Write a protein that binds this ligand. Structure first.
Ligand code: FMI
Length: 294
């Protein structure tokens, strides 16, 4: 029961170029399969997958986390909290088939990094070395957070992932991406207009839209705006809590600051629970397809 240490182990003989190739394959497929989810593309769901496979981590005993790539196991991919992520896993299947040497955890997390960057978001340094662990290491369902709670719930919950107020608010900015799907989560609607472009729109919408507390077709409350956007109760709590509100305003007024803080928090999220040897490779910063002229 003693907390196990997960030491990053580089896939045998692999280096930056090998991973840039995987990044490129993911990026090229994101471009090709553009029709998904009414042309939103697979970017958002890949970011959600990267987060859900990392968000099971418990700092108290180092269980869960991105290291083991346990989402490949039935108990975890059937977690009600992960409904809809099967689309992201299916997307990555041909990628893993072409590059069988990459670990599942490295693939799931790299998928998120690739999606953020290809969607014009900040560069996210990424480290390789996650190693697949047995099915009995799969964390039980119920470790991911709920969306119907308040600011106090959010603050306490994220302490388990060792995230502070600024880190939590920055991470939530990813909701500028994609949308909620009634069938998956009991919530329906996008948070903004630019569904597959990474910007600080989430914060701007929270502060500038006129929100009304309504019930959706699943009988759950959510905040709606005449513009056709929505906010989860947890999203809205970010402007109800005075400490979160200050940070929301900061990001709504400084795109660069949001990008920098999100990058750090997202990398931290994807690396929680992993011990990187002193002589491990430095974090990789992948070039986008655009930067490579591809
Ligand atoms: C850093 C990234 C991130 C964080 C930290 C983070 C944190 C949290 N999220 Fe969010 N998320 C991300 C990224 C991130 N999310 C993205 C990109 C999406 C869109 C997915 C898609 O469009 O398919 C979604 C979609 C989504 C949905 C709709 C799912 C669906 O119906 O398909 C819900 C209900 C929630 C709830 C919650 C919380 C409040 C409960 C878990 C929460 O704590 N999310």
């Amino acid at each position: 029961t003693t907390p196990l240490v997960h030491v990053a182990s580089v896939e045998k003989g692999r280096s930056y170029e090998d991973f840039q190739k995987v990044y490129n394959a993911i990026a090229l497929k994101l471009r090709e399969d553009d029709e998904y989810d009414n042309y939103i593309g697979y970017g958002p769901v890949l970011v959600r997958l990267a987060w859900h496979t990392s968000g099971t981590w418990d700092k108290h005993d180092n269980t869960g986390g991105s290291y083991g790539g346990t989402y490949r196991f039935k108990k975890e991919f059937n977690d009600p909290s992960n409904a809809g992520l099967q689309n992201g896993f299916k997307f990555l299947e041909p990628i893993h088939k072409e590059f069988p040497w990459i670990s599942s955890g490295d693939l799931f997390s790299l998928g998120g990094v690739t999606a953020v960057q290809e969607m014009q978001g900040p560069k996210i340094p990424w480290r390789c070395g996650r190693v697949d662990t047995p099915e009995d290491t799969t964390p039980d369902n119920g470790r991911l957070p709920d969306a119907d709670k308040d600011a106090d719930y959010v603050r306490t919950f994220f302490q388990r992932l060792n995230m502070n107020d600024r880190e939590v608010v920055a991470l939530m900015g990813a909701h500028a991406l994609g949308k909620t799907h009634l069938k998956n989560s009991g919530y329906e609607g996008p948070w903004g207009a630019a569904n597959n472009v990474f910007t600080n729109e989430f914060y701007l919408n929270l502060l500038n839209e006129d929100w009304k507390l309504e019930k959706n077709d699943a009988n759950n409350e959510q905040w709606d705006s005449k513009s056709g956007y929505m906010m989860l109760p947890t999203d809205y709590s970010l402007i109800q809590d005075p400490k979160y509100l200050s940070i929301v305003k900061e990001y709504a007024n400084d795109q660069d600051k949001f990008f920098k803080d999100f990058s750090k928090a997202f990398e931290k999220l994807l690396e929680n629970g992993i011990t990187f040897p002193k002589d491990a490779p430095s974090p990789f910063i992948f070039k986008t397809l655009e930067e490579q002229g591809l």
